[PDB]
């Protein structure tokens, strides 16, 4: 409540004030990605949209079913398979506040500042309900608790337990879905992996064979491609190429085409880019095959 | 005598520099050099006093009864703890040591001076948690005829910088006024930790608190007959500056009891107050020699009583004492879970 400087009379009330970092992390401009820019993810997209988006637009079906909508969905996977891009597309398609949050941003300076910040995040999410929090790189604070007498990281564990208590416990509010995209699911604390907390654990696999062709097609729109590029051949050429390893292929092919002076890329430039990006990053020396 | 209006700021006299000037430390936080009023009884300006200061000038204008500024109060009768020396079973050597280092020096200092020994001015009751460190002092306060100012360690530290050393000096002044007196700074391992961070405000204030405590304890002359007692669960996490002659020298060593006689004595002491059935043998309970503490061997009897209450029996039997041993003391794990090691 605002109050006069000298008479101390209550001049006027004020809205609740959160930490200034919490105001900034709210997304303002919607990132333009759409589900048409993500390829090779059909099971994962359907699982996520039917667990974080569906119980936010047609929750009446769930209420009729008399069932508790899931709290949040974990998004574990190998690095560079779309664990973050899918969140961008979800924020594009959704119609609710989409507070982003990097897990290292939670870890802070003084005792309890991180807990206060992560409590104010959920308070703000409850204020502008419904919401989708996107705690990202969860392994930054989600490391396993451990006993130690020498020394420890007892500060980060404060934020971890505060996040656990905000996800489940006395406070739920049941209207704040929480997404999380870790990379090493083998490190997360067992409590954070429990139900009630993040329920859906969508696995992001390396792209299938047709998935690679779809990825190459999507990421070769802006560039001046040719009309003879065989996407099937390129997709087969890449084997266990994970997501961004295909965008790198497109970028390298364009760079090679520009370097050689061609005004538009060809299949040969794409193959050269394939060789450039791949574990042939050394290349050269054709000795003894 | 007009400056003695009744807005006033309590200060703490530190050093008499001249006949009409002094160095006071106002409660606002910062020290001053002020002119002393020429009417005060200048014989009362003892160091770490509780003088009053004028509002905007800070000129010393009034000395207060030195038992007034104290935020900590002498334990009276409403807070008189209700345990007895008889209730504290066992710890016979510990009881004798604390009696001869706390009570007897308070009563008869002339014997100490005549014999030639140095009277102790500090005890450091320490041991594993759950051994009676707090209870023995609690029983002492139920029988002592001296003031028993009881401070509680972490209570010293506050946000307000300067609310530390100030209140330490105030507590010691209160102890010195009501002599004989016993200070019982408890859980001192939260104030006197070894490792130190000379960059954060947290440690640089606990440092001042410890320095003030150490200086005040060193200021103890042969007289003033005030003894200091502190207890801790971890003796290693303690500043070695607190273990020197003139400071804490006597060290009581509350052990996790393993002697059969001690466990028998304390079990009988606890059983006497309770409602053990005539056909119930504690000797059958104490057949095996464990590392049983002085506290667990009372919570076990509480558990046995609760078990008897559950079965609607209003007097505990042997069958419940036997079951109590199996639920309150199972293992310490360690390596006994693996028999092949021995």
């Amino acid at each position: 409540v605002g109050v006069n400087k000298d008479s101390y009379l209550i001049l006027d009330t004020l809205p609740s004030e959160f930490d200034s970092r919490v105001k900034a992390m709210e997304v303002d401009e919607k990132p333009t990605e759409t589900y048409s820019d993500v390829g090779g993810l059909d099971k994962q997209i359907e699982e996520l949209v039917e667990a974080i988006v569906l119980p936010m637009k047609r929750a009446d079906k769930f209420k009729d079913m008399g069932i508790r909508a899931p709290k949040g969905a974990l998004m574990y996977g190998p690095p560079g398979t779309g664990k973050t891009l899918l969140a961008r597309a979800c924020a594009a398609q959704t119609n609710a506040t989409f507070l982003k949050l990097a897990a290292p941003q939670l870890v802070q300076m003084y005792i309890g500042e991180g807990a206060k910040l992560v409590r104010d995040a959920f308070a703000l999410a409850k204020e502008k309900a419904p919401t989708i929090i996107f705690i990202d790189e969860l392994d930054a604070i989600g490391t396993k608790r451990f006993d130690s007498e020498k020394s420890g990281d007892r500060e980060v564990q404060r934020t971890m337990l505060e996040l656990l208590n905000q996800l489940d416990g006395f406070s739920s509010d049941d209207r704040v879905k929480v997404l999380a995209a870790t990379n090493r699911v083998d490190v997360l604390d067992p409590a954070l992996l429990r139900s009630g907390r993040l329920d859906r654990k969508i696995e992001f696999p390396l792209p299938s064979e047709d998935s690679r062709a779809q990825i190459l097609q999507i990421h070769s729109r802006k560039m001046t491609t040719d009309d003879d590029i065989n996407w099937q051949e390129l997709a087969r050429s890449t084997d266990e190429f994970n997501g961004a390893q295909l965008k790198a292929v497109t970028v390298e092919a364009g760079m090679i085409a520009l370097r050689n002076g061609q005004s538009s890329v060809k299949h040969e430039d794409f193959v050269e880019g394939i060789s450039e990006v791949q574990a042939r990053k050394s290349k050269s020396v054709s000795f003894y095959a | 005598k007009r400056i003695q209006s009744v807005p006033l700021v309590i200060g703490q006299f530190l050093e008499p520099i001249d006949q009409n000037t002094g160095i006071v430390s106002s409660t606002t936080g910062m020290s001053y050099v002020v002119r002393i009023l020429s009417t005060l009884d200048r014989e009362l300006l003892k160091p770490s006093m509780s003088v009053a200061l004028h509002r905007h000038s800070n000129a010393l204008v009034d000395i207060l009864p030195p038992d007034s500024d104290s935020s900590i109060s002498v334990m009276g009768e409403n807070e008189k703890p209700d345990v007895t020396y008889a209730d504290v079973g066992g710890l016979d050597m510990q009881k004798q040591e604390i009696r001869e280092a706390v009570e007897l020096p308070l009563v008869q200092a002339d014997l100490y001076e005549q014999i030639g020994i140095d009277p102790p001015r500090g005890v450091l009751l320490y041991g594993p948690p759950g051994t009676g460190k707090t209870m023995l002092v609690k029983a002492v306060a139920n029988s002592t005829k001296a003031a028993f100012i009881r401070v509680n360690g972490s209570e010293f530290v506050h946000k307000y910088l300067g609310e530390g050393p100030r209140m330490v000096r105030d507590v010691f002044r209160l102890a010195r006024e009501n002599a004989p007196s016993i200070i019982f700074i408890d859980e001192v391992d939260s104030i006197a930790t070894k490792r130190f961070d000379a960059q954060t405000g947290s440690d640089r204030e606990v440092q001042r608190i410890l320095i003030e405590l150490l200086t005040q304890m060193d200021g103890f002359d042969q007289s003033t007959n005030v003894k200091v007692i502190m207890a801790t669960n971890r003796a290693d996490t303690l500043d070695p500056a607190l273990l020197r002659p003139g400071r804490l020298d006597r060290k009581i060593e509350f052990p996790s009891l393993r002697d059969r006689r001690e466990r028998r004595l304390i079990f009988g002491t606890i059983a006497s107050k309770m409602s053990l059935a005539p056909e119930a043998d504690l000797d059958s309970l104490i057949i095996r020699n464990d590392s049983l503490s002085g506290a667990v061997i009372a919570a076990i009897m509480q558990e046995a009583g609760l078990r008897a209450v559950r079965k609607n029996r209003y007097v505990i039997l042997q069958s419940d004492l036997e079951e109590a041993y199996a639920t309150q003391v199972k293992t310490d794990n360690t390596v006994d879970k693996f028999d092949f090691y021995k």
């Binding site: - | 070894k194 490792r195 130190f196 000379a198 960059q199 640089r204 440092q207 001042r208 320095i211 500043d239 070695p240 500056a241």
Partner: protein, 47 residues
């Protein structure tokens, strides 16, 4: 004492900084402070 030299008894850098109540990165801070008060003896204990 009889030679009339100040007897310093440092027993650890953390304890030295804690007792003098000032920051220091390495232990030679005692050396400059001891050079002013000479003659002096530095006594380091063990366990």
């Amino acid at each position: 004492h009889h030679t009339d030299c100040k007897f310093i008894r440092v027993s650890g850098a953390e304890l030295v900084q804690k007792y003098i109540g000032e920051g220091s990165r390495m232990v030679r801070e005692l050396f400059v402070m001891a050079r002013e008060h000479a003659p002096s003896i530095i006594f380091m204990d063990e366990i």
